[PDB]
Amino acid sequence: DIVLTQTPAIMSASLGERVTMTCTANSSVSSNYFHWYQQKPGSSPKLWIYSTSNLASGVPTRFSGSGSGTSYSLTLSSMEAEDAATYYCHQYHRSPPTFGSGTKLKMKRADAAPTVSIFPPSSEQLTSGGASVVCFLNNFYPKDINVKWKIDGSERQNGVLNSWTDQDSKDSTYSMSSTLTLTKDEYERHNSYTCEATHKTSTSPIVKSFNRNE
Amino acid sequence: EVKLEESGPELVKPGASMKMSCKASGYTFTSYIIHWLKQKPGQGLEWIGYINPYNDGSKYNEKFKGKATLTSDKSSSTAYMELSSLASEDSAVYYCTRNYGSDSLDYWGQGTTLTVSSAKTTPPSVYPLAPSMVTLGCLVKGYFPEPVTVTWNVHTFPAVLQSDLYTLSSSVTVPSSTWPSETVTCNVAHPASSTKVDKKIVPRD
Numbered sequence: 001d002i003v004l005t006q007t008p009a010i011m012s013a014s015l016g017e018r019v020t021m022t023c024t025a026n027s028s029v030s031s032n033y034f035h036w037y038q039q040k041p042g043s044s045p046k047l048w049i050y051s052t053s054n055l056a057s058g059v060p061t062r063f064s065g066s067g068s069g070t071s072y073s074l075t076l077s078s079m080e081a082e083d084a085a086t087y088y089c090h091q092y093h094r095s096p097p098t099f100g101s102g103t104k105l106k107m108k109r110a111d112a113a114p115t116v117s118i119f120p121p122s123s124e125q126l127t128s129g130g131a132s133v134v135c136f137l138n139n140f141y142p143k144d145i146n147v148k149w150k151i152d153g154s155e156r157q158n159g160v161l162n163s164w165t166d167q168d169s170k171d172s173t174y175s176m177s178s179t180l181t182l183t184k185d186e187y188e189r190h191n192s193y194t195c196e197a198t199h200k201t202s203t204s205p206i207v208k209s210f211n212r213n214e
Numbered sequence: 215e216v217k218l219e220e221s222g223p224e225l226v227k228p229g230a231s232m233k234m235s236c237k238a239s240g241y242t243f244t245s246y247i248i249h250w251l252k253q254k255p256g257q258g259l260e261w262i263g264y265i266n267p268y269n270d271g272s273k274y275n276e277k278f279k280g281k282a283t284l285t286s287d288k289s290s291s292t293a294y295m296e297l298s299s300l301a302s303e304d305s306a307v308y309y310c311t312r313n314y315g316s317d318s319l320d321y322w323g324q325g326t327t328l329t330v331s332s333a334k335t336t337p338p339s340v341y342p343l344a345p346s347m348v349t350l351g352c353l354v355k356g357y358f359p360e361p362v363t364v365t366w367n368v369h370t371f372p373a374v375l376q377s378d379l380y381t382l383s384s385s386v387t388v389p390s391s392t393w394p395s396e397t398v399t400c401n402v403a404h405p406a407s408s409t410k411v412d413k414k415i416v417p418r419d
């Protein structure tokens with residue numbers, strides 16, 4: 001089980017940037033049996049480069065591959081958004097064949113502020129004794145973002161589930177969902193619920209609230 | 215055209231076994247080896263073994279030679295992987311893929327997600343998220359296992375597991391003149407419980 005070490009583990013690139021990523025082996029591997037794969041989230045790997053430098057069918061010519069012995073690389077001459085993916089190296093010089101832990105290539109793009117929306121518990125949910133407040137933070141960049149929940153102006157940290165989308169295929173932004181779940185009893189004992197997003201695009205937080213009076 | 219069609223996602227209890235399938239089409243089944251690989255979320259690929267359907271010979275990673283059994287049926291051009299004595303750590307996406315020139319892996323199945331857990335299969339509770347462009351959504355709560363599909367009539371967020379139940383949400387952005395004059399409905403399917411929900415987005419009060 002020949003160890004393959006890919007670097008960088010994570011990297012970003014703007015449209016047009018040249019990208020090179022490396023795969024280093026702990027033992028020598030024949031170039032004929034060294035291959036690369038591309039994988040996007042939720043889908044299967046596809047063969048990308050085979051036998052070090054041959055492009056798989058449908059792979060655009062801006063890709064190339066190179067190497068021998070213990071050092072291999074994949075090169076992207078000009079980054080496009082469809083190229084954001086994880087790339088994996090593969091050796092079949094020895095059984096068991098092994099693969100790298102991947103270089104995750106992301107798209108860099110202009111900063112963008114999140115569009116924030118807040119939603120109270122549905123009466124359906126309340127009927128069953130639960131109360132979830134939901135906040136969506138849509139189409140922002142960069143990924144780094146701090147959502148805070150406040151109840152009558154006091155921070156709540158417990159009972160919050162946050163989920164991020166992967167970079168959008170078209171605009172390369174992220175979106176995020178934040179769900180604060182309380183008991184119906186706890187929820188009905190306060191008036192205002194506030195979702196606050198801090199993001200580098202504003203010195204002030206983007207804030208949405210509702211009150212149980214409207 | 216070559217295609218490898220894998221069987222659906224399965225939830226299995228720890229201690230049990232399961233067998234998944236990989237139906238091949240578009241080439242001579244016996245002329246190519248099929249490999250099987252495991253990929254846990256966030257991680258790279260780990261090779262399990264391969265099947266040669268010509269002579270029924272399979273070859274294993276030493277790590278899996280106990281747990282995994284690779285078979286094939288020539289008549290239906292289907293390869294199968296059985297995993298036994300399952301535990302949490304077997305939860306992963308499993309791929310079959312065809313061996314091509316110089317043992318490159320040229321065609322891949324779509325993956326079979328295996329979940330190993332003691333948790334109860336549970337259908338979702340679906341809740342409407344109601345307040346020029348207006349954002350609506352729906353909260354899909356209290357279900358197990360993955361996956362759920364959400365369809366409207368869009369951002370759909372990956373599910374988050376807590377206390378063996380998943381929470382997922384989906385947001386939709388329409389113009390003001392559409393809602394609430396029109397019906398807006400999020401359609402949730404949870405194939406593991408064979409359930410669906412047609413939830414109308416109703417205004418409050």
Ligand SMILES: *[C@@H]1O[C@H](CO)[C@@H](O)[C@H](O)[C@H]1NC(C)=O
Nearest residue numbers: 001002003004005025026027
């Ligand atoms: C592989 O090489 C790295 C880097 O030189 C080393 O630290 C690591 O322990 C090696 N792994 C094995 C299994 O020999």
